């Protein structure tokens, strides 16, 4: 690895300091973690070129360039958040200021290396118009250039480039997202007979569309066809027409054959100015004049002669100097009116100022009081005071996002925020095929649950939903009494990779903690899922998922006893209507019926946005887009130990005669008796739902480890362990003697304490979720 870089440097004769920067960029963690911001969907993407997770601030600006670089051959490497560069530049005044700047990407190619910064259209124009000597446009190459970035590049043997989103071909992006699953595979081997069959069918017919080839009964599937596509045996232009639309994509054997096969206004504006009532009036005028235009005038005409004559004269005038005479009969009532403001200008200015500085303020003052204050100020200033109706009417002219944000806040103004309306064909909002974009979201189900055995109320369970954005099919549903914590995530994803088969490609997930954790990100990296993050307080970015909660309310949850629906009006609640006295459901049965609804009731129901049931859309998409059996994750023991979490370090030492220390407990295995792995660090994994069992990576295999308290620490969860540890620390804090926390104290706490309300609540929660586990496992 180092020798090839050294030969690269020698061939390109990069200076000592340039080699120093390249070496620093190559071996360094990214400077800053990408922040959600307020308008950018952020996240991480797995790259097989580098073989690591690369962070993008914007999924439609920087991410397309990342996709290109990942699938570009000229690029060797592309680091993200390279170390800051102190760009020196003279501003408009003339002062030469040095501003720290972090380029979006640092790209090392086969003949050059340097910095690449991703921006948008309007950002580039505002920065250019606000900084003449920092950005400018070269129409020769049609590229945006930054003076200090390129200057620093030229002082170091490197290059500097600005990637905008004008030059990105979105058809290319769609096709890359289509074939990324086949790209990530490593042993694509199409059967020779089937490949020959397709080669014959392709060579017998040039320009054959993808849809008209897939439908042929050649004993083949779509996985085979797309595998031939990705290996360039069959040439499809991944630059003009997307593969998601297989009815507009011609297929050719090679590139050469594909290339050969490829090789008055004012009057109309007057009509546009008309109203349906004006149109009807013009029609009436035409019907009145028409007998006078045919030599057969009527003997009974109520309309007087002068108006008929004027209409006829204007008809002739229009047919002379316009081209058509009907357009001369247009009234255009909209221009009429008195739009002049009747209030004096000083009265306006004062009332504008008062609406600005006394109504839209962090007080939510009512209109009457602000009008009264305005009237008092006007009477002090000797100007005309507007009436209350005028104040209410103008306040009604300021409604929308700005006023709601300046009065209630940014959370309340979000309803009237905006809709991003697609002009061109960007990447589709809800994906192109099944298992492309899946959203993950949790909620607190509005239903009270009693204990299965003792019958005491347990509260409202939490529901975790993973749902694909294409077919709306509820991919995986989970129910647990606990708050949002990884266990949640291991679970939904276990079921996903269990009853279905694999997993998403882009998984959006809000800015939780369960998602900013190390475990979820590491698992997504391991299984190569692009992690996308919506900005804080913004909900439309997972809107398709979130509304699936509301449906679950109306179709299954709000039609149950003890639902937490009437508690929205807390002020109207009585002991006769409290759901904690009406609740009868349990966690296991509620989960069972929720799964039934999500898997065979909502699954067979037709969707307005698909005109088919989610299962039918799923089947059609996976038939058109291929089954992609290679990306299947088999639900076996290997996946079982792969989903399990671990500590912060990742590995633990094997102390002789004691084992490995995980979460205050010690774990031992037979293979630990071997001195080869004794007093050495081995990777550890811990089961959150069964503490008494862990796993250790020894001699190229995960091996189970059992704690020394199996009869006393089996079946317990880890949340109960932290509860016991905290209570033990507090109980020993009731005394001055400092007894350290070890395994035996926790063991006798578990074997002695049985009536603690919080601990009993925890054991009840674990016993309840055990039945959900059994229901998942087929019981």
């Amino acid at each position: 690895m180092k020798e090839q870089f050294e030969q690269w440097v020698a061939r390109l004769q990069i200076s000592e300091a340039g080699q120093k920067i390249i070496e620093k960029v190559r071996s360094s963690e990214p400077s800053r973690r990408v922040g959600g911001g307020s308008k950018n969907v952020s996240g991480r993407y797995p790259s097989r070129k580098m073989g690591v997770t690369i962070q993008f601030e914007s999924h439609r600006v920087a991410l397309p360039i990342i996709y290109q670089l990942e699938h570009d051959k000229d690029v060797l490497e592309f680091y993200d958040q390279p170390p800051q560069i102190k760009l020196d530049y003279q501003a408009s005044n003339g002062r030469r200021l040095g501003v720290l700047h972090t380029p979006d990407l640092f790209v090392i190619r086969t003949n050059s290396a340097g910095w690449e910064e991703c921006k948008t259209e309007q950002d580039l124009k505002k920065l250019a118009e606000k900084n003449p000597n920092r950005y400018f446009y070269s129409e020769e190459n049609n590229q945006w250039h930054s003076l200090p970035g390129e200057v620093y590049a030229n002082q170091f043997g490197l290059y500097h480039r600005i990637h905008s989103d004008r030059e990105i071909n979105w058809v290319l992006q769609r096709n890359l997202q289509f074939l990324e699953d086949y790209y990530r595979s490593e042993s694509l081997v199409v059967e020779e007979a089937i490949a020959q069959s397709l080669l014959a069918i392709v060579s017998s017919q040039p320009g054959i569309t993808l849809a008209e080839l897939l439908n042929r009964s050649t004993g083949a599937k779509s996985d085979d066809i797309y595998t031939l596509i990705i290996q360039e045996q069959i040439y499809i232009d991944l630059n003009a027409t997307p593969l998601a639309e297989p009815e507009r994509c011609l297929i050719f054997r090679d590139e050469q054959t594909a290339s050969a096969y490829r090789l008055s206004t004012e009057s109309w504006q007057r009509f546009h100015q008309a109203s349906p009532e004006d149109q009807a009036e013009a029609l009436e005028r035409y019907k009145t004049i028409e007998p006078y235009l045919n030599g057969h005038p009527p003997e009974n005409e109520t309309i007087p002669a002068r108006t008929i004559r004027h209409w006829k004269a204007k008809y002739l005038i229009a047919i002379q100097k316009y081209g058509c005479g009907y357009i001369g009969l247009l009234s255009h009532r909209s221009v009429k009116g008195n739009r002049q403001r009747k209030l004096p200008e000083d009265t306006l200015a004062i009332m504008e100022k008062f609406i600005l500085e006394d109504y839209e303020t962090l007080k939510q003052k009512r209109m009457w009081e602000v009008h009264a204050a305005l009237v008092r100020a006007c009477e002090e200033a000797g100007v005309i005071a507007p009436s209350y109706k005028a104040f209410t009417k103008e306040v009604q002219r300021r409604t929308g996002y700005e006023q709601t944000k300046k009065r209630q806040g940014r959370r309340a103004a979000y309803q009237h925020e905006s809709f991003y309306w697609e002009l061109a064909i960007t990447t589709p909002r809800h994906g192109d095929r099944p298992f492309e974009i899946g959203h993950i979201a949790h909620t607190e189900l509005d239903v009270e649950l009693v204990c299965s055995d003792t019958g005491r109320n347990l509260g409202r369970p939490w529901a975790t939903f993973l749902v694909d954005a294409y077919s709306r099919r509820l991919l995986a549903v989970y129910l647990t009494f606990d708050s949002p914590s990884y266990r949640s995530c291991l679970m939904v994803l276990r079921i996903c990779v269990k009853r279905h088969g694999r997993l998403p490609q882009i998984v959006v997930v809000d800015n939780g903690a369960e998602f900013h954790s190390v475990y979820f990100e590491t698992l997504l990296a391991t299984f190569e899922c692009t992690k996308k993050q919506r900005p804080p307080a913004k909900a439309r970015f997972g809107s398709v998922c979130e509304r699936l909660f509301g449906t679950s309310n109306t179709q299954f949850v709000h039609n149950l006893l003890g639902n937490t629906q009437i508690t929205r009006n807390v002020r109207q609640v009585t002991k006769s209507v409290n759901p904690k006295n009406l609740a009868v459901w349990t966690l296991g049965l509620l989960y069972e019926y929720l799964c039934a609804w999500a898997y065979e009731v909502y699954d067979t129901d037709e969707h307005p946005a698909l005109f088919q049931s989610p299962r039918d859309a799923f089947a059609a998409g996976m038939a058109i887009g291929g089954s992609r059996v290679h990306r299947m994750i088999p639900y076996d023991e290997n996946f079982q130990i792969l989903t399990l979490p671990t500590t912060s370090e990742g590995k633990a030492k094997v102390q002789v005669g004691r084992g490995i220390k995980i979460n205050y407990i010690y774990y031992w295995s037979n293979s630990f008796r071997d001195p080869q792995i004794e007093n050495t660090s081995v990777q550890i994994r811990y089961d959150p739902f069964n503490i008494g069992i862990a796993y250790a990576f020894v001699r190229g295999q995960w091996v189970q480890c059992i704690s020394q308290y199996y009869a006393e620490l089996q079946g317990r969860s880890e949340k109960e362990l932290k509860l016991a540890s905290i209570e033990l620390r507090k109980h020993y804090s009731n005394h001055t003697q400092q007894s350290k926390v070890s395994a035996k104290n926790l063991a006798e706490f578990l074997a002695s304490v049985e009536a603690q309300e919080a601990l009993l609540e925890q054991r009840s929660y674990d016993a309840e979720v055990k039945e959900v586990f059994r229901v998942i496992e087929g019981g």
Binding site: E29, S31, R33, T53, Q81, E521, T522, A525, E528
Partner: peptide, 15 residues
Amino acid sequence: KVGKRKPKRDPIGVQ
């Protein structure tokens, strides 16, 4: 910051 993971470059792939 507070509660935010360090900007580590996570390896990918199933071992």
